Amino acid sequence: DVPLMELSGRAPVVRLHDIEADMAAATDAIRSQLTGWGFMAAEVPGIGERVEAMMNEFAAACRATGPSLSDYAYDVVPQLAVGGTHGFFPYDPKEFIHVSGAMIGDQPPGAGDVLRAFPAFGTRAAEVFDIAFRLISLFGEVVRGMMPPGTPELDLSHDATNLRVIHYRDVGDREVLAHEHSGIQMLGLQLPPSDQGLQYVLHDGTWVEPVIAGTDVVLCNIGRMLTSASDGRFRPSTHRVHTKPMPAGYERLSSVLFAYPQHKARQWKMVDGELMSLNATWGDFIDSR
Ligand SMILES: O=C(O)CCC(=O)C(=O)O
Ligand SMILES: [Cl-]
Ligand SMILES: [Fe+2]
């Protein structure tokens, strides 16, 4: 069906305590991945145990009998006048939460309440957000370094960026846990999930299955905003989640950082080797879809 793709001990090693020097040393390999595959990968020693602990707290939060997670559903959580929707998204056979940079900062006031209600999860969600945001900002300079001179800094927004933490459960007979898709935003950073099943398409249309469950491998996804800003040079890193039919009580945990620029900032594109300034904003780009 779908061939497995080994990355552990193949992808460049990026230590968080040495992140800038390691990302500079990794940049030639990462550029080769984007060119050759259409998504990028780095092995980040220790990140797997940090993400596993964070996702285990999220699962415990999903089960909890006081405080309760559905009291922080997105429709009872303060939202920015301009922005995406953060907060809990009750039961795709999944429930998930969006922890935004704004929520970590308690913006608007009360947005942070879920992080205080579930502090074991909330501390670890902020830890993983910060790790992921540092990595993805450096992947964003790799991609910018591949583009023409004059390409603007991606200027990823801390507050507009979201960590999505997903708990798949009661999947019954599903084969498809996540349909074929790409992120609307600039970049995604897929953190090591609890199980296999996430698959990516290669430039020739072949689907492959990164070996990432219980590893320290992270994947970096091109989103549609960067496809647009690159005038179609970098296709979205289209992906999906499959499973063989599973028994009752099967669960899967996965987390991904969605990195957004400022919604109010005007769009741009590198066209014909030159910066083209657009009237529409990044918020307009989202609203278009
Ligand atoms: O469950 C996963 O591993 C990936 C989920 C994903 O692609 C997404 O939520 O956009
Ligand atoms: Cl996505
Ligand atoms: Fe995705």
Describe the structure in brief:
Helices cover 29% and strands 26% of the residues.
How would you describe this structure to a colleague?
The longest helix has 28 residues, at 119-146. The chain has one domain (4-288): Jelly Rolls. Helix 1 (19-36) crosses helix 5 (119-146). Strands 2-10-7-12-5-4-3 form a seven-stranded antiparallel sheet. A five-stranded mixed sheet has the order 1-9-8-11-6, with no helix packed on it. It is globular, with a radius of gyration of 18 Å. With 289 residues, the chain is an alpha+beta fold. It has seven helices and 14 strands. A hairpin with a 4-residue loop joins strand 3 (87-89) and strand 4 (94-100). The protein has helices spanning 19-36, 47-63, 101-104, 113-117, 119-146, 224-229, 282-287; strands at residues 4-5, 40-43, 87-89, 94-100, 162-169, 176-181, 187-190, 198-201, 207-210, 217-222, 239-242, 251-259, 266-271, 274-281. Residues 163-259 form the Isopenicillin N synthase-like Fe(2+) 2OG dioxygenase domain.
Helical content, roughly? 25-40%
Trace the largest sheet across and list its strands: 2-10-7-12-5-4-3
N-to-C SSE series? EHEHEEHHHEEEEEEHEEEEH
CATH architecture: Sandwich
Largest sheet: 7 strands, antiparallel
Strand content: 25-35%
- The strand count comes to 14
Shape: globular
CATH topology: Jelly Rolls
The kinds of small molecule bound in this structure are: 2-oxoglutaric acid, chloride ion, fe (ii) ion
Cα-atom radius of gyration: 18 Å
Q: What is the level 1 CATH name? A: Mainly Beta
Q: N-to-C terminal Cα separation, in Å?
A: 32 Å
CATH superfamily: B-lactam Antibiotic, Isopenicillin N Synthase, Chain
Q: Estimate nothing, just give the exact number of structural domains.
A: 1
What is the number of helices? 7
